[PDB]
Structures are given as structure tokens and as C-alpha cells.
Amino acid sequence: GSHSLKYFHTSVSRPGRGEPRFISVGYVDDTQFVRFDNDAASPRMVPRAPWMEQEGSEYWDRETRSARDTAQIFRVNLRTLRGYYNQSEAGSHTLQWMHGCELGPDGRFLRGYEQFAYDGKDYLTLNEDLRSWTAVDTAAQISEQKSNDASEAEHQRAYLEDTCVEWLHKYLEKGKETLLHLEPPKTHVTHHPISDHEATLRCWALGFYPAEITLTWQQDGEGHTQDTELVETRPAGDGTFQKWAAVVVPSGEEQAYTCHVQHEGLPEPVTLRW
């Protein structure tokens, strides 16, 4: 196929109630498998998947320190930025960080990335070559030089290039079942008429995994598509997703229309008609 190991970190400052909230959730594409929540009843790194349960103390301890340490640097970071922007300590701010590495369909390193955002916006990005940074503010420039003089990209590149891919490997192994298993979409059309002379046709894809999916409403051949409302793919809550596309048709013409559904767990594309 093609895989990624990626983490998302968020730190939120809490003026009145002291020490900022720090959350950290990791993913092997589309599947969360760990998370750290300095707020949780257990400020420890915990497994979120079950295939992760088969991991020894060493790991959880180590990852727990990692998260703790980042939460600490992130709290220093949040203060520095409150400074660069000459900001009151009485307001809340968010520092986010996302990083991940990807494998080629051929199994090895492919691309790796890293970014920071502050109050919702891009702040510093590790460049493609993975040897430099692009600031976005001037505040960010200070963070940029600081960064280079420190040589952070060097560290980041190592992690990103080995460590990250090496473990992605190990997680794919330990998640053999779950991870490599695709779940195709149960599918179906529905009719909901609007006026005396037209109705809505809704194509439905339910229970599929992974989440990439494609729904198209084309009429008899030309498959030009007419405005089709596509809700944002969503989670069912069980590990699978749901999605649906709607189009408005003139009663009587409901056959002129066909819905095509694309998804890895399908030996082939599926067509539906009302």
C-alpha cells in the first residue's frame, strides 16, 4: 500500500488555572494507537489501540517521559511566544505541532514533515530537504535563527528518516490484522422528494475503512456531474466511516442517474441505482 507514522501535539495555555493543557495523539495512518493527555486521570502515554497492549513498561515509561518533556518545552515555548507577540498572560494560546514520516509503496522512507502553528496559524515549517526552516512571521524569524544555530533540523531529520520509519515498521507488524485489513462500504440509494416534480437522491456509503472513499452521481453515460452535495466523510464511532452524496432529480428520471462508489476494500467500483 503506503504508510505513515504521525503525531499531533497541542498545548493550550490556561491563564487562571495554571499549567497549560498538553495533548498528544499518535497515528499509524488513520488509526490512533497512543495518546498522552497531561490532563487525563493518568498523565502517562497510554495505548489507544489493542494491538498496542502487547507493549512492555520500558516503552510506556520512555514515551511518557517524551511526552512530559515536550509538554515542558511547549510550556517554555508558549511563554517565549507570548513574548514575541507582546501578549498578555491573561489570555489563552495554542501551540500545535505535527510531524510524520511516510513509506513508499515500496516499503522505505518516502517523505517526512514537520510544522508548528501558533493561535491557529502556520508559524514555522521544516522544509522539504529537511535541513532548513521557513518562518512565517518575523517572530518566527527569531525562532528560525535560533533554530538553525541550534541545529534542530539535523535531529529532526534523523528521527524523521530512521526512527520514525523503523518503528512504523514495527507498528505495522504488531497491527497486522487491523491495519492491513480493509472494510468496504455497505451502499445504497434513497429517495426523498422535494416538490411535485423533483426529489433528492442520496447515495450512501456506510461502515467502510480506511476513510478514503469516492462517491459520484453521474447521469446515464456522460457522467457530467450536476451539483452534488457531499458531506464531509465521518466517523461512525466503531472504527469505520460514513459518507454520502446527494443530487436533485426531476421525478420520473431517477434511472437516468447512477452513483459510483470507489474504495480500496472493493475488488472493483460499485454502481448504484435507485
Binding site: 503525531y7 501535539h9 498528544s24 499518535g26 520512555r62 514515551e63 517524551s66 511526552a67 518533556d69 515536550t70 518545552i73 511547549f74 517554555v76 515555548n77 517565549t80 511566544l81 505541532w97 510531524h99 508548528f116 514555522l124 525562532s143 535560533k146 533554530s147 541550534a150 534542530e152 535531529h155 529532526q156 528521527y159 524523521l160 526512527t163 520514525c164 518503528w167
Partner: peptide, 9 residues
Amino acid sequence: VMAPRTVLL
């Protein structure tokens, strides 16, 4: 694993 060290901004 998450990265061993984070950037100091």
C-alpha cells in the same frame, strides 16, 4: 515513537 526532542522556539 514520538520524536526524542522538540524545538525550542
